[PDB]
Amino acid sequence: IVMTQTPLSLSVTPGQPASISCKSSQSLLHSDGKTYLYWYLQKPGQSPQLLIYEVSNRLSGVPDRFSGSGSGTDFTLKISRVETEDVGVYYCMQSIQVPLYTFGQGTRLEIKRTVAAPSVFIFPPSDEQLKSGTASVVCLLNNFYPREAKVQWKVDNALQSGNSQESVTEQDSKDSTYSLSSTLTLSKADYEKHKVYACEVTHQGLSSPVTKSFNRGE
Amino acid sequence: QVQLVQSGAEVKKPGASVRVSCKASGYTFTSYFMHWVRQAPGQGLEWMAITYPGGGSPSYAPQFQGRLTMTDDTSATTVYMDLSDLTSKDTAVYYCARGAHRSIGTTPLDSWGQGTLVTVSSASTKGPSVFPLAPGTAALGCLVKDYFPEPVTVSWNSGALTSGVHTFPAVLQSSGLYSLSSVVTVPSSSLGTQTYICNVNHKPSNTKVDKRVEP
């Protein structure tokens, strides 16, 4: 049994309602009216918490802006009015038959806000790190929305690929923005063979891609 | 009041086995099902196993290929998991969770332990190197590089500096060591007088480092 959640990510202006769907590959209706589909919310850094069980039953203490529905294969979790505490990952879970229980892949709920372009910064490797034989060049995109963004590393105007990793913060509770840091790694030898290190950023709030660069050695 | 208190984080090499325990209290231990669920970093929940204490025959999600055993000790009101033949696919937070009353059903899962991180890697425990990220608004920060395993925490100026701070999720490098950055934006005017120190704590290696970040 496969559960397919939709959408993968949902942005809601606060106070607006929200809908999350979970579709099962076969009916979860146990031959008794009970349908074995539950909903959990997991907030960042926390364990999951039960929201809805057996299709539509609200767990004890769950606020009544939450509800669930669905009778066999199509299930929906609905929030009357999205308070901002509701941000997180929602999982459906089916338990029709032991030991074949499964979870959906999760839908991420985020706060919708106005478009905000990244503020970009680039950091050379420190002299201290260079002494050890590797160079980390770090690019920072501060406080942007929406989440989707593209960082392109260029060394002497040659497009880099395969030598960087990035990660993204959770949505900031105050301004609903994201931040992203990309690390380009090379050996000290490779680092010292080039001049201009450049971070090229593509975001919806930027009419043209912003590039931040430096010449190695100031 | 239900409590589910799990044992502490584990580090294992590929091929090993890991045991995680969950001490339950506040209810009749033998009248509820118990579950194990795990979550690999940044991934979804995966249901693993279920039993009921004192006379249960546990059952296991089939993808564990028989590597997973669940047991319970009713006189200690504790449930255990043992996961053998570990690989890096098993790096995850492992959760114990109370299921339904035995007269109601197996699910839902109404109470959850705090989670136990198990890291499976050939890497050995190692504190980070901390390098400066040197700067009308200045960004500065610390690159916390080449540590193992997770987690690390970072503060700025002993916690007095919280506004503008972003500490990013760690990335797992091809070396098998982690690296993360923590940054803060400050007024460019303050760079001359204000001191900025990142306080990094890597409890797995018993390491605390302070790094002053200068222009």
Provide the token pair at B128: 């980070």
Across the beta sheet with B153-156, the strand order is: B153-156, B197-202, B207-212
Chain A, residues 131-190, CB within 8 A of chain B, namely 132, 136, 138, 140, 142, 165-169, 179, 181, 183, 185
**Contact criterion met (CB below 8 Å) for A38 and A23:** no
Nearest CB to B46; choose among A34, A42, A103: A103
CATH class of domain segment(s) A1-112? mainly beta
**Shared domain check, B112 and B14:** yes
Return contacts of A146-151, CB within 8 angstroms, 24+ apart.
A146/A11, A146/A115, A146/A178, A146/A204, A147/A9, A147/A110, A147/A178, A148/A203, A148/A204, A149/A118, A149/A178, A149/A180, A149/A201, A149/A202, A149/A203, A150/A201, A150/A202, A150/A203, A151/A180, A151/A182, A151/A199, A151/A200, A151/A201
**Contact criterion met (CB below 8 Å) for B41 and B92:** yes
Residue where the block lists tokens 């420190």: A126
A119 chain-B contacts, CB cut-off 8 A: 137, 139, 185
Instruction: Find how far residue A92's CA is from the centre of its chain.
Output: 18
Measuring CA to CA, which residue among A5, A82, A16, A74 is closest to residue A40? A5
Q: Which helix H or strand E contains B57, and what residues bound it?
A: none
**Shared domain check, B37 and B69:** yes
Pairing of strands B137-147, B32-39: unpaired
**Shared domain check, B15 and B47:** yes
**Shared domain check, B106 and B127:** no
- Method of elucidation: X-ray
Domain map of chain A by residue range? 1-112, 113-218
- Please state, in angstroms and rounded to a whole number, the distance separating the CA atoms of residues A82 and A90: 14
Largest CA distance in chain B: 69
Contacts of B184 (CB under 8 A, 6+ apart): B139, B140, B141, B156, B161, B164, B165, B166, B196
- Please state, in angstroms and rounded to a whole number, the distance separating the CA atoms of residues B176 and B152: 15
Neighbour-count burial for A35-48, b at 16+ CB within 10 Å, e otherwise: bbbbbbbbeeeebb
**Contact criterion met (CB below 8 Å) for B202 and B127:** yes
Contacts of A31 (CB under 8 A, 6+ apart): none
For residue B138, the chain A residue with the least C-alpha distance is A121
Provide the token pair at B210: 């302070």
Burial of B103 (0-12, 13-18, 19+ CB in 10 A): exposed
Domain that holds residue B214: 123-215
Measuring CA to CA, which residue among A188, A206, A200, A212 is closest to residue B139? A212
The CA distances from residue A83 to B45, B124, B136, B155, in Å, are: 24, 44, 35, 29
Chain B, residues 33-72, CB within 8 A of chain A, namely 37, 44-47, 49-50, 59-62
For residue A136, the chain B residue with the least C-alpha distance is B143
The CA distances from residue B152 to A163, B142, B160, B198, in Å, are: 24, 13, 19, 12
Which CATH fold would you assign to the domain A113-218?
Immunoglobulin-like (2.60.40)
**In this structure, which amino acid lies at residue B118?**
V
CATH number of the domain bearing residue B152: 2.60.40.10
Pairing of strands B10-12, B116-120: parallel
End position of a domain, from candidates B88, B104, B122: B122
Total structural domains within chain B:
2
Q: Which helix H or strand E contains A79, and what residues bound it?
A: strand A74-79
